[PDB]
Amino acid sequence: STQIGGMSLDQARTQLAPWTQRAAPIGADEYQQRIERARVLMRAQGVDALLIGAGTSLRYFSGVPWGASERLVALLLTTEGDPVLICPAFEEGSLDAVLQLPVRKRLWEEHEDPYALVVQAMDEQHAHALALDPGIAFAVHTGLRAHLGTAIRDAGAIIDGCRMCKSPAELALMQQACDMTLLVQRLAAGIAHEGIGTDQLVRFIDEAHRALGADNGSTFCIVQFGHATAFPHGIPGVQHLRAGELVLIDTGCTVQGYHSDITRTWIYGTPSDAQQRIWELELAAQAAAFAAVRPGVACEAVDQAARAVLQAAGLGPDYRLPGLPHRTGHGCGLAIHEAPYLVRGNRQPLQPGMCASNEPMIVVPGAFGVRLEDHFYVTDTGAQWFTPPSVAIDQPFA
Amino acid sequence: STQIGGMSLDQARTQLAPWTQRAAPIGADEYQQRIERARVLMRAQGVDALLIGAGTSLRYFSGVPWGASERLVALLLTTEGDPVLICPAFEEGSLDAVLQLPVRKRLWEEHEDPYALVVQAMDEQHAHALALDPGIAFAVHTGLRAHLGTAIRDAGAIIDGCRMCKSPAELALMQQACDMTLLVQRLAAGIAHEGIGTDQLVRFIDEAHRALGADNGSTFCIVQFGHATAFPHGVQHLRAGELVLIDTGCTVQGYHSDITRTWIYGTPSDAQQRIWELELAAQAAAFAAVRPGVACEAVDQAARAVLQAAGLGPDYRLPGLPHRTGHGCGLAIHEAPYLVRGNRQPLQPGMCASNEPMIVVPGAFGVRLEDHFYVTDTGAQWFTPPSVAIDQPFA
Ligand SMILES: [Zn+2]
Ligand SMILES: [Zn+2]
Ligand SMILES: [Zn+2]
Ligand SMILES: [Zn+2]
């Protein structure tokens, strides 16, 4: 009965001191190890240059945490020497302040062509086999094509083959973000009451992540009530809570860029039989997916394990509704969604240090949905939860 | 400093009722005009198929406001029939709630190849000359190339040829967002006091944008005091004698405001006054240069000629203007056309851009004044009137 409702704003505020179990930042040597692993995968693929654009992969490789813009900010890695950092001249100051890796800077004034610098740096090292970051804007392919006549490969296999398996230091940053968001989830369930707005919960979760010391409040937040829980990614519009509705809250933060991403679905007031039944089936499907995880297991096998529970209960098969209309889970790291994907058709074997969500949501069309989301990482012999799963329809927190 | 300081938090709150002059949303017919306009651009350039990714361009053509993810959500426009909307099958309900244009849905299940669906819709209409959104992830080039033997061209000319010139309805939405954000700016100036935190200003700017009825509070907020104003891409507490620089904005129906004010709290030095005045003059001269037919790069040069005649610069040297003068603005904070040296693009009626020829004095301070304008048949019109003096940030 006790986790849902009855907590005031300022009672909740009393649990929101800055978080004091702070994981260490990624250190210099770890950035060099990332570069070295990228070089190994480059040579494996027969490529001799890699271009990484601003975003999660530039951060991974260099520390630079800036979002992509219309101006090319990029790392060009070749098989030897400090990687080249292509960046607007006016930003040099700022760049030097966030860089965690020694680089050769190649700066361009506003009217200069930054893609000519990439190719000039290629030509300097006799590199003629470029792989380009699949996350980068298409525009960069156009700019490179004005100067570069050889095939441009997709760098996805190189990037994933680095980022998929998390180091201990990555796992602890993730763990920190997750503990923080779990606390936030718990307090939002506490402050809930008849008539509370979805927007009031969203603003609260944001204030709470901030108080705790997230990099930037809530990375995202989804709050849905009642029938609106039937849409995996929700519909526009504010709702107000009523007894008898499910509440689905999916939110997360970052800590040094590393993401949490947790969904809780709980009853406010008394559940129907149908709500209970679906809610227990969801917990069961999530548990079977977790139980399937260890080294060597194909990513699709984990998704299949979830569907097997649904299907033994008369749901599915496949994506059929009522059932699980989307994949079981996604990888998580510096990006909310990254490889590997726990999806039908993905033969990728799971390996120690891989991180993914386990969120086999059930949708009952016309009625509601239940999504329980906790992330795990693969160990040497099985998996570990970052956050323990829910206990019951009215006990969202183990 | 009647504009700067002296206002209580609840005095400020009395001017924060919801905005009553609400611009009309973009209606169904105007989405159809954008699709036609794209079709004609396509024909002009010899392109028969156009793929637009999730993001501001999808929003422009379809009303779908979602950010891009790892899953392909896209609009494929060909020379005839309803456009095709490629989408994950499970998000169909959520898609239907935001779509503003009639489309032929082509849904894909989690394990199916959505790039296959694009090419199949191409093959059906006999379209072989595809142009791809330059803002879409390169991954999409990869998935398309897997299925295509033919050139995949860059769609920037087509997309820009539509988006750069704003309709009356788009200008009205931008206008509302600007008017709302100007008020927020002025209230933030009013509540400023010795000791106030940059974080408290940020928080208040958000609350106000929400109270006035922005889509989602502040889109972004930069607040910098004193020496920090010299580091435009760097928590502080306000002290007498410091410049305050606040750059913020909101959206109304996804249309952006983006305004920077820089003002003195207390008594300014001669150096601060002289640079402030020069910032206003540079901004004024870039504006006086705006009219149809003028190259975007001439507007940037008009600001730099002001700075050079005063002994700053030249070019991008400091003290001076180390970056372009401004950027286009619309459904994206930054979009074409850019007011930057090398850009020959002629300005035309309806185009919207910022005018922000920030001066940096290394290691001391910076002064950015940012107001946006749109191009008219004979010149330009400010979305917001420029500042008046170092201590009079609002006209
Ligand atoms: Zn989630
Ligand atoms: Zn997730
Ligand atoms: Zn701005
Ligand atoms: Zn701007």
Short mmCIF file of N, CA and C and ligand atoms in Angstrom, two decimals, chain A residues 261 330 337 357 359 373 375, ligand 2:
data_model
loop_
_atom_site.label_atom_id
_atom_site.label_comp_id
_atom_site.label_asym_id
_atom_site.label_seq_id
_atom_site.Cartn_x
_atom_site.Cartn_y
_atom_site.Cartn_z
N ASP A 261 17.60 5.12 -17.39
CA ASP A 261 16.47 4.91 -18.25
C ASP A 261 15.59 3.82 -17.59
N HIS A 330 17.10 -2.43 -25.48
CA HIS A 330 18.13 -1.75 -26.24
C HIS A 330 19.38 -1.61 -25.37
N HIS A 337 19.86 4.99 -26.48
CA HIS A 337 19.71 3.77 -27.25
C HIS A 337 20.98 3.53 -28.06
N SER A 357 18.54 -2.50 -21.72
CA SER A 357 17.33 -2.42 -21.03
C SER A 357 16.62 -3.78 -21.15
N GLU A 359 12.60 -4.46 -20.93
CA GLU A 359 11.38 -3.63 -20.91
C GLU A 359 10.35 -4.22 -21.90
N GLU A 373 10.72 -1.43 -16.79
CA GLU A 373 12.05 -1.25 -17.37
C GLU A 373 13.13 -1.06 -16.33
N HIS A 375 17.60 -1.87 -16.35
CA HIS A 375 18.74 -2.24 -17.21
C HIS A 375 19.60 -3.23 -16.45
ZN ZN C 2 14.69 2.05 -22.56
#
